[PDB]
């Protein structure tokens, strides 16, 4: 069977080898390095690829698996928020999906500022937050949506649609049913907002580096990877893109950690099986 133990064992073997090769070496020329005395990485083991980095001071990467373009990043550090907000604005972000739980954000030691559920000032940037709808995703998991309005004198005011899942603990994987519903809500949200910029003849519709959905959890490698992988399968243009392709492309474009827990890769495998999508290549 294309989804039998033998196939699953082979896929893991290839993935394992890749993760070891992409392991960040001290002062690795493939990863972004902290220039100066400013902390860049939230974790010394979760690094950001250099050739796909969005900004030099943020741990974020441009990711494209198949025809699906997104942006994965770590939960911004306190001192990166200003730069984080400019990135969202400039990108004309059609949707921001936050997969970090409320419990993690509340934990003051985790250093994860609640920058989207409350209004505030960060440097030259002014952010206003407003709660909109709440969508049930199944298994009791809920999606809380907000609208972030980013204002900066001299720049055009940009509002961003936010989808926050607060009850998805780290190092865990939600059911494939939930993941499929969450992937749909994010595309719909992005699709609606993107439509707006097109009706306004925005200059971002022509730039492949903009109008990309931004997604992140805590490290931006576990929960973020699961959603992205699910979003690719939603795209009707990724026909024949295998599970091997997806994970490979994510790791080579961010870091070999993308899709941390096996339980997470299992959800992707399950969704692929439901689509008759190949696991391995050739």
């Amino acid at each position: 069977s294309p989804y039998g133990p033998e196939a699953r064992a082979e896929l893991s073997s290839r993935l394992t080898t890749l993760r070891n090769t992409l392991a960040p070496a001290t002062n690795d020329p493939r990863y972004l390095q902290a220039c100066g005395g400013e902390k860049l990485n939230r974790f010394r083991d979760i690094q950001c690829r250099r050739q796909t980095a969005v900004r030099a001071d943020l741990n974020a990467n441009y990711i494209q698996v198949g025809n699906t373009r997104t942006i994965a990043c770590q939960y911004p550090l306190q001192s990166q928020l200003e730069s984080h907000f400019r990135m969202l604005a400039e990108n004309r972000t059609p949707v921001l999906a936050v997969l970090a739980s409320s419990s993690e954000i509340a934990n003051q030691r985790f250093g994860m500022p609640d920058y989207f559920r409350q209004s505030g000032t960060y440097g030259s940037i002014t952010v206003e937050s407003k709660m909109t709808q709440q969508v049930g995703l199944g298994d009791g998991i809920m999606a809380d949506m907000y609208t972030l309005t980013i204002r900066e004198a001299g720049q055009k005011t940009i509002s961003v649609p936010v989808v926050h899942v607060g009850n998805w603990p780290d190092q865990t994987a939600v059911s494939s049913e939930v993941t499929k519903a969450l992937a749909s809500l994010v595309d719909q949200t992005a699709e609606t907002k993107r439509n707006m910029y097109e009706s306004k003849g925005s200059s971002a519709v022509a730039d492949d580096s903009k109008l990309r959905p931004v997604i992140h959890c805590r490290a931006g490698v576990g929960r973020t990877a699961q959603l992205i992988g699910a979003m690719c399968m939603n795209d009707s243009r990724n026909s024949q893109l295998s599970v091997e392709d997806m994970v490979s492309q994510m790791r080579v474009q961010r870091n070999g950690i993308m899709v941390q827990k096996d339980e997470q890769l299992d959800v992707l495998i399950k969704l692929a099986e439901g689509q008759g999508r190949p696991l391995l290549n050739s």
Binding site: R44, D45, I257
Partner: peptide, 4 residues
């Protein structure tokens, strides 16, 4: 810190 280490995310592990």
């Amino acid at each position: 810190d280490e995310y592990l």
